[PDB]
Amino acid sequence: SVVEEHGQLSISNGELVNERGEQVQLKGMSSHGLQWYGQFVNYESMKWLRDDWGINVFRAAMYTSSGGYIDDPSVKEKVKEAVEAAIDLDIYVIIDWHILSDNDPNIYKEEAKDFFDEMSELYGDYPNVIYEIANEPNGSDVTWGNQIKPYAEEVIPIIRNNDPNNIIIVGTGTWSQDVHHAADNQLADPNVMYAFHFYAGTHGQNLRDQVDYALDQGAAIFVSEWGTSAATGDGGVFLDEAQVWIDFMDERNLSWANWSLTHKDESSAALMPGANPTGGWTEAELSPSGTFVREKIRES
Numbered sequence: 001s002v003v004e005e006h007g008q009l010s011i012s013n014g015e016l017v018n019e020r021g022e023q024v025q026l027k028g029m030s031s032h033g034l035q036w037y038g039q040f041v042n043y044e045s046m047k048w049l050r051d052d053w054g055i056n057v058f059r060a061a062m063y064t065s066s067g068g069y070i071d072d073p074s075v076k077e078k079v080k081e082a083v084e085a086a087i088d089l090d091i092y093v094i095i096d097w098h099i100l101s102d103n104d105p106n107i108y109k110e111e112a113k114d115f116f117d118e119m120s121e122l123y124g125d126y127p128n129v130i131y132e133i134a135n136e137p138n139g140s141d142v143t144w145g146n147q148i149k150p151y152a153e154e155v156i157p158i159i160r161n162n163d164p165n166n167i168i169i170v171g172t173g174t175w176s177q178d179v180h181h182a183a184d185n186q187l188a189d190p191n192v193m194y195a196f197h198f199y200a201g202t203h204g205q206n207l208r209d210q211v212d213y214a215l216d217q218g219a220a221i222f223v224s225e226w227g228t229s230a231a232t233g234d235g236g237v238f239l240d241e242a243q244v245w246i247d248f249m250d251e252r253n254l255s256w257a258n259w260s261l262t263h264k265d266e267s268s269a270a271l272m273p274g275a276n277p278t279g280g281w282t283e284a285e286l287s288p289s290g291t292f293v294r295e296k297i298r299e300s
């Protein structure tokens with residue numbers, strides 16, 4: 001009864017709070033690209049995550065390029081199945097317009113406005129929904145001030161015409177790491193959060209200090225994607241640094257979604273090759289990364 005208990009989420013003094021104004025922290029899993037690993041995104045696996053792992057949020061990563069939504073828009077229906085499962089299971093769900101190789105969110109901004117108009121018209125009167133309008137803006141030529149903020153100032157109005165106040169997570173520069181610039185030039189919408197993403201393979205002490213700077217400017221931050229691996233999503237599992245970040249996020253009340261729920265042979269993947277796509281995994285069917293993440297959320 002997560003969503004029944006906490007209900008409508010909002011931002012109050014830079015913190016995520018429930019409908020009675022108490023701080024809440026979401027912890028869950030992100031899918032990998034829905035064009036590649038969509039079989040792991042269904043009501044049964046989401047229910048297993050909710051009951052066995054204790055997740056209270058699920059992120060549907062809908063890549064736009066890389067064979068995603070622009071090339072084949074049928075993947076939007078998998079997003080709709082994830083949202084409906086989340087509503088049926090009473091947990092939160094992030095709709096992620098997963099840009100990456102299409103590094104500037106303006107590339108497919110017309111398509112994004114149509115997509116977000118449709119999703120917000122369909123689900124805008126449910127409190128489960130959290131919109132993530134541009135996963136990871138990246139490149140030297142993509143800045144908060146010139147590219148990202150103006151993109152958000154075109155997409156947010158579309159959402160807000162149908163859904164006045166569900167949370168909107170906006171990506172930041174340099175693969176959603178540059179929360180410092182966003183926090184110094186914040187968006188006007190009161191229920192916006194800035195995305196901050198990390199990989200435990202990277203030494204993170206300055207990155208934690210930068211999140212603290214942003215929080216100190218009153219910006220709300222959602223860690224909408226993080227992994228236990230290096231920044232490529234592979235290259236080993238780094239659990240000592242992962243735990244430091246876990247503890248940091250609990251001290252700051254940061255919500256998070258781990259990357260990712262798939263059986264791909266890469267360190268960040270949560271499942272081993274024989275894991276059933278509908279849930280029920282044994283210990284042997286979780287990777288080193290998946291076992292750690294599951295323990296962190298169960299401990300919560």
Ligand SMILES: OC[C@H]1O[C@@H](O[C@H]2[C@H](O)[C@@H](O)[C@H](O)O[C@@H]2CO)[C@H](O)[C@@H](O)[C@@H]1O
Nearest residue numbers: 036066100232233234259260264266268
């Ligand atoms: O295997 C599917 C698809 O994955 C691509 O790599 C992913 C990586 O698995 C993920 O952890 C990371 O966040 O993003 C990259 C890039 O999308 C891989 O490059 C493709 O060749 C592959 O088909």
